[PDB]
Amino acid sequence: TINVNTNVSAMTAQRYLTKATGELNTSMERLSSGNRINSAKDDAAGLQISNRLT
Amino acid sequence: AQSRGLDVAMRNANDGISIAQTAEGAMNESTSILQRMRDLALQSANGTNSASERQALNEESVALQDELNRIAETTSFGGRKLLNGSFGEASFQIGSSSGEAIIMGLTSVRADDFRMGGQSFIAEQPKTKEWGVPPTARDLKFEFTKKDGEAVVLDIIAKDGDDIEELATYINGQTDLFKASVDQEGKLQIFVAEPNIEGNFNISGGLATELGLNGGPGVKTTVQDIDITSVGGSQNAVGIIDAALKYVDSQRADLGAKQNRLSHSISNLS
Amino acid sequence: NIQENVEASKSRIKDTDFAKETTQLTKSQILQQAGTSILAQAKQLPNSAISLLQ
Amino acid sequence: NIQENVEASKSRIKDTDFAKETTQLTKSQILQQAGTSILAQAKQLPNSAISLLQ
Amino acid sequence: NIQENVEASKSRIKDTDFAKETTQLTKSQILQQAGTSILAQAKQLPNSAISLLQ
To answer: Are B212 and B220 in contact (CB under 8 A)?
Structure first.
């Protein structure tokens, strides 16, 4: 309690900020490109079927 | 010590994410190139192209193939070639302790790869438009073994009184493992993608004898073995690029699965 | 006609519905700002209480 | 596309994450202040005790 | 419609109510400051009294 060498709350805040930033970047990419699935990570089966349909 | 190990594991997982993303981008470009080549092959099949514009389309296809070779050879994550087959099955540490890892695999994308296409069989006896399938012999039985090991047999019955082209369309419609077609002289070209065949393709049925079909080991053709100066070339090219697109999409799906597993693992490690 | 239907399906699977994704982007921006605000309040006071303790 | 991916990885390996480093900076600042306070407390008491005894 | 209702219910259960939690955060900061002040006052007075007696 009232520690110095470790700040667990700051670590959790950093983790959640990183998650928010990652989601923000993904959303920004999806907005700019105009496609929801730009890389296989977004969706595997979705990407496959979309490529076949295109 | 566990915290330091987790730092190392997170760094390694991030490096793997970056390599996966680079390979995914290169594969995306390759599949776009393949789609364009499919469009060109379909265009050349048109029967209004005399000879010269066929040569122009063939030149375009050759340029696209050279681009495919260039992208396969060049993609590198700082000196680490990704799609030339050098990557192999690498390993990435994924945790604090020694023993947890994910084997990252990147199969080559060269146009000479054997997964970039498959086997082709060409009918020996050409048939012109006047000819139709005889009502006497209509059964057409295929027997082969897929790469996964599950043997397959088909017993396609050809509707009587259809010309060779309609027979090709019917055979295409009946099953997906095939891509039948007809060349300039009307010889049926049966194409089987590489993952869809492993062994001797054997044929039977009276119709096969009538058409002169001879199922055998087959002519091995990948994307690099594409020439679109002839109608049959265009059709078997459509089939070849379809199989190649399937292979590329499978590879991209595998890379996406690896990326998702890496993301989940890094979140867990954090 | 078949191309019309195929294009509609491809857009459904691939195209990003701008409303949902812009809502998601605004939510992610809010989350990032909140995380930064908490981190600013977490990196300073919990660590700085000790100097007051001395 | 390759340049975008390479720049992302280069930033991740090289470019600093300001949240972590700002937290580290604040922690180091507080540690320095605590060290100065402890040094001030520890310089005067021991030397002064013996002089008091005399 | 079902997804909208389920999302509303999940928000009621899981999602934090920012007003309540921000008020709680401010109250907790206040309580920590009061505790530190009281601890500082208690650290030196009761013990220093005995030394003053000498």
So the answer is: no
| H-helix or E-strand spanning residue B206 | helix B206-211
The CA-based angle D27-A13-E37, given to 5 degrees, is 55
Which of D16, E38, A3, B38 has its CA nearest to residue C45? A3
Contact present, B62 and B227 (Cβ < 8 Å): no
Dump the DSSP string for B78-134: SS-BSSSS-SEEEEEE-SSSTT-EEEEEE----TT-TTSEEEEEE-SS---TT----
> Do D and C touch (≥3 CB pairs < 8 Å)?
yes
CB distance B230 to B189 below 8 Å: no
Closest-CA residue of chain A to B257: A41
Method used for this model? Answer: cryo-EM
Neighbours of chain B (3+ CB pairs under 8 A): A, D
Q: What is the C-alpha separation between B187 and B110, in angstroms, rounded? A: 30
Q: In what order do the strands lie in the sheet with B219-222?
A: B178-182, B188-193, B117-122, B219-222
- In Å, how far is D54's CA from the nearest CA of chain B? 50
DSSP state of B222: E
Nearest to B223 by CA among B207, B239, B209: B239
3-state class of A46 per DSSP?
helix
Residue B25 is nearest to which of D2, D12, D13, comparing CB atoms? Answer: D2
**Chain A residues within 8 A of C43 when measuring between CB atoms:** 7, 10
Q: What is the resolution of this structure in A?
A: 3.4
Query: Could D37 and C51 be called an inter-chain contact, meaning their C-beta atoms sit closer than 8 Å?
Result: yes
Give the CA dihedral B209, B212, B218, B223, nearest 10 degrees. -130
H helix count then E strand count, chain E: 2, 0
The CB-side HSE value for B33 (13 A sphere, CA atoms) comes to: 25
Mutation target to probe the C interface, by most C beta carbons within 10 A, among D21, D23, D30 is: D30
- Residue B219 to residue B230: CA distance in whole angstroms: 17
Q: How far apart are CA B21 and CA E52, in angstroms?
A: 72
